[PDB]
């Protein structure tokens, strides 16, 4: 409206239109507009950012600024009054395993990250924030409200970093803040490859003409490969336990090493990228260094997009699957690819499915040794526990013979995730998750709930008694409009999360909607979709249909055990077969005769 395009982060860019490969950013998928769904640009905005001011200031800031003429409430005391709970039984899903949330995260890493503005780096008025708990400038800290216990052991408030923004720091007045997405829009292994390149390059082996990803020089699983540490300091791997000196892991996403089933996942996909390229270079011998990457880099692009959209989004989306996501009709390059600010939000109903506990199992799939079982705050920013406690085997077989949390009305996000976060540089594991969502939520603009059930077409509740019969519970509706007054205020990750989950899914009908959605422009609005005709040969696409979870663990751990359907609540040994009954990644038709 203001300006036509602003942009004053890097300009600079070619496109070879002949490449068959993605770039590390993202840049020249959508030819008539190469910068659509690259990394380092604005989030799209599918409706109009929503501040106190207009601009930038978020709803919640200024004491006596209303929203529609009341007040919003604080984030921690919707976490306190809404979200927590006490007890960990019978909360658990009967029909997902860990795996189900644990591929969430990962994916939910391929598409999108809002880094908190870390320009400053003379900055100290950290302090100011977290010892002082004043707001100002990039500081929006979360107080606490009376009768909060961490009050008595914890001061008044959370410190909480405004995300960065495009055009970029210190802003004008012209149009609203949009926050940047760093990572690239598309499905693509960003989060195993990197999103730009300095980091693409630190992480390939450029020592010897193989196309290998660099490895862990320090540390070994039976032979099976680790990711390379990341050296600077400080280290909040390190921080979590000195006598370890364990630093956190380097991989394409900066946010690899957040928790042990997360590095988990991340050393599954980097060990995979070696293991393609050693069976292409076996296969093509004469191929050099960049060509074996490039086509292992494609390949594990492929199994990401494959397993999200074959056998993840379906059980996720239930009923709504087929609504938002029919199946493909080819690439279409006037669909927009960008991942939108209000999907970073819908996306965090994974914080719901995360469970108070992380399992080793043995071979029998019992207890891995008497710490078998260990709550998921000692888990943050954990590396020492893969590297000095038996690797990478033990904690996939709690991925598979493990359950996800269900999400529930009265049951909602863990006290190990609400009350013990550990966040790098603040020293203790005492933050609220659900908290930090709802205040972030204000920081991006975000529309409330009814704006968003407007846009999925869907009713608009205004009464008590209206929201009642739409969350199908009347205490959970009486507690959110006691706090937020009107259902117009509701933040759009609580009111979103708060909504009974879709027949055979496990998000309601608003998430469905927003979540279909932006999965079928990531499908449709990608040149590399994997199923797109030129990308992938008839005989290359036959072979990576056959892929699956299973068959990764079978080719990349000494896990010899496992399910046919991953995702599923599998149990041990019913519901596992041999490794051989598995079907494998037939890698024939990538044999290249250069006559
Ligand atoms: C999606 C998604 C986001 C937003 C990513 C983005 O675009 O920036 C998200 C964020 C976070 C954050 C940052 C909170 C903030 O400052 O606003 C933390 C600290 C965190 C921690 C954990 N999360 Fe999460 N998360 C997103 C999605 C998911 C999903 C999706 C299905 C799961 C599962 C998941 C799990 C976890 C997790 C598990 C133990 C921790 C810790 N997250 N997330
Ligand atoms: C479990 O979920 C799958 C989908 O993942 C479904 O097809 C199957 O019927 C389910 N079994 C149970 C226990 O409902
Ligand atoms: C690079 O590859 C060679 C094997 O081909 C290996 O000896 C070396 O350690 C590797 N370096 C890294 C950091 O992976
Ligand atoms: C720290 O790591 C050491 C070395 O592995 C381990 O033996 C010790 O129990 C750990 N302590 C904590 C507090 O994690
Ligand atoms: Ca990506």
């Given amino acids: 409206?203001?300006?036509?395009?602003?942009?004053?982060?890097?300009?600079?860019?070619?496109?070879?239109?002949?490449?068959?490969?993605?770039?590390?950013?993202?840049?020249?998928?959508?030819?008539?507009?190469?910068?659509?769904?690259?990394?380092?640009?604005?989030?799209?905005?599918?409706?109009?950012?929503?501040?106190?001011?207009?601009?930038?200031?978020?709803?919640?800031?200024?004491?006596?600024?209303?929203?529609?003429?009341?007040?919003?409430?604080?984030?921690?005391?919707?976490?306190?009054?809404?979200?927590?709970?006490?007890?960990?039984?019978?909360?658990?899903?009967?029909?997902?395993?860990?795996?189900?949330?644990?591929?969430?995260?990962?994916?939910?890493?391929?598409?999108?990250?809002?880094?908190?503005?870390?320009?400053?780096?003379?900055?100290?008025?950290?302090?100011?924030?977290?010892?002082?708990?004043?707001?100002?400038?990039?500081?929006?800290?979360?107080?606490?409200?009376?009768?909060?216990?961490?009050?008595?052991?914890?001061?008044?408030?959370?410190?909480?970093?405004?995300?960065?923004?495009?055009?970029?720091?210190?802003?004008?007045?012209?149009?609203?803040?949009?926050?940047?997405?760093?990572?690239?829009?598309?499905?693509?292994?960003?989060?195993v490859y990197?999103?730009?390149?300095?980091?693409?390059?630190?992480?390939?082996?450029?020592?010897?003409?193989?196309?290998?990803?660099?490895?862990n020089q320090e540390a070994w699983d039976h032979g099976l490969a680790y990711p390379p540490f990341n050296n600077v300091k400080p280290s909040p791997c390190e921080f979590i336990n000195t006598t370890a000196h364990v630093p956190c892991f380097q991989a394409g996403d900066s946010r690899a090493s957040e928790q042990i089933l997360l590095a988990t996942v991340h050393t599954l996909l980097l060990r995979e990228h070696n293991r393609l390229a050693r069976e292409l270079k076996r296969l093509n011998p004469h191929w050099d260094g960049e060509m074996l990457y490039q086509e292992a880099r494609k390949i594990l692009g492929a199994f990401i997009q494959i397993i999200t959209f074959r056998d993840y989004?379906?059980?996720?989306?239930?009923?709504?699957?087929?609504?938002?996501?029919?199946?493909?009709?080819?690439?279409?390059?006037?669909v927009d690819p960008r991942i939108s600010n209000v999907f970073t939000f819908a996306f965090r109903f994974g914080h719901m499915e995360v469970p108070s506990t992380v399992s080793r199992l043995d071979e029998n799939y019992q207890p891995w040794g008497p710490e078998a079982e260990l709550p998921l705050h000692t888990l943050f920013f954990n590396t020492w526990r893969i590297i000095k406690d038996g690797?990478?085997?033990?904690?996939?077989?709690?991925?598979?013979?493990?359950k996800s949390k269900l999400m529930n009305q009265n049951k909602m996000?863990?006290?190990?995730?609400?009350?013990?976060?550990?966040?790098?540089?603040?020293?203790?594991?005492?933050?609220?998750?659900?908290?930090?969502?709802?205040?972030?939520?204000?920081?991006?603009?975000?529309?409330?709930?009814?704006?968003?059930?407007?846009?999925?077409?869907?009713?608009?509740?205004?009464?008590?008694?209206?929201?009642?019969?739409?969350?199908?519970?009347?205490?959970?509706?009486?507690?959110?409009?006691?706090?937020?007054?009107?259902?117009?205020?509701?933040?759009?990750?609580?009111?979103?999360?708060?909504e009974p989950m879709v027949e055979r899914g496990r998000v309601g009908p608003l998430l469905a909607c927003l979540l279909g959605r932006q999965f079928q422009q990531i499908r449709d609005g990608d040149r590399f979709?994997?199923?797109?005709?030129?990308?992938?040969?008839?005989?290359?696409?036959?072979?990576?249909?056959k892929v699956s979870f299973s068959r990764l663990i079978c080719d990349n751990t000494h896990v010899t055990k496992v399910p046919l359907h991953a995702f599923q609540a599998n149990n041990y040994p019913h519901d596992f077969v041999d490794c051989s009954a598995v079907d494998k990644l037939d890698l024939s038709p990538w044999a290249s005769r250069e006559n």
């Fill in 1 to 191: 409206s203001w300006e036509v395009g602003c942009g004053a982060p890097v300009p600079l860019v070619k496109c070879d239109e002949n490449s068959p490969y993605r770039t590390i950013t993202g840049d020249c998928n959508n030819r008539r507009s190469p910068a659509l769904g690259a990394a380092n640009r604005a989030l799209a905005r599918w409706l109009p950012a929503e501040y106190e001011d207009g601009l930038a200031v978020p709803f919640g800031w200024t004491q006596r600024k209303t929203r529609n003429g009341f007040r919003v409430p604080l984030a921690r005391e919707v976490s306190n009054k809404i979200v927590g709970y006490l007890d960990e039984e019978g909360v658990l899903d009967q029909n997902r395993s860990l795996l189900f949330m644990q591929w969430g995260q990962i994916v939910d890493h391929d598409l999108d990250f809002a880094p908190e503005t870390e320009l400053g780096s003379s900055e100290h008025s950290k302090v100011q924030c977290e010892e002082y708990c004043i707001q100002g400038d990039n500081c929006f800290p979360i107080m606490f409200p009376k009768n909060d216990p961490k009050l008595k052991t914890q001061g008044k408030c959370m410190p909480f970093f405004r995300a960065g923004f495009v055009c970029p720091t210190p802003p004008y007045q012209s149009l609203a803040r949009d926050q940047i997405n760093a990572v690239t829009s598309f499905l693509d292994a960003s989060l």
């Fill in 194 to 215: 990197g999103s730009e390149p300095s980091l693409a390059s630190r992480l390939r082996n450029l020592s010897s003409p193989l196309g290998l990803m660099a490895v």
């Fill in 313 to 334: 989004l379906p059980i996720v989306l239930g009923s709504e699957m087929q609504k938002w996501i029919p199946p493909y009709q080819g690439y279409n390059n006037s």
């Fill in 391 to 402: 690797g990478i085997d033990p904690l996939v077989r709690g991925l598979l013979a493990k």
């Fill in 413 to 498: 996000v863990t006290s190990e995730l609400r009350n013990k976060l550990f966040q790098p540089t603040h020293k203790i594991h005492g933050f609220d998750l659900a908290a930090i969502n709802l205040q972030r939520c204000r920081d991006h603009g975000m529309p409330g709930y009814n704006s968003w059930r407007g846009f999925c077409g869907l009713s608009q509740p205004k009464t008590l008694k209206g929201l009642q019969a739409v969350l199908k519970n009347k205490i959970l509706a009486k507690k959110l409009l006691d706090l937020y007054k009107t259902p117009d205020n509701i933040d759009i990750w609580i009111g979103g999360n708060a």
């Fill in 529 to 545: 979709w994997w199923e797109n005709p030129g990308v992938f040969t008839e005989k290359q696409r036959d072979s990576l249909q």
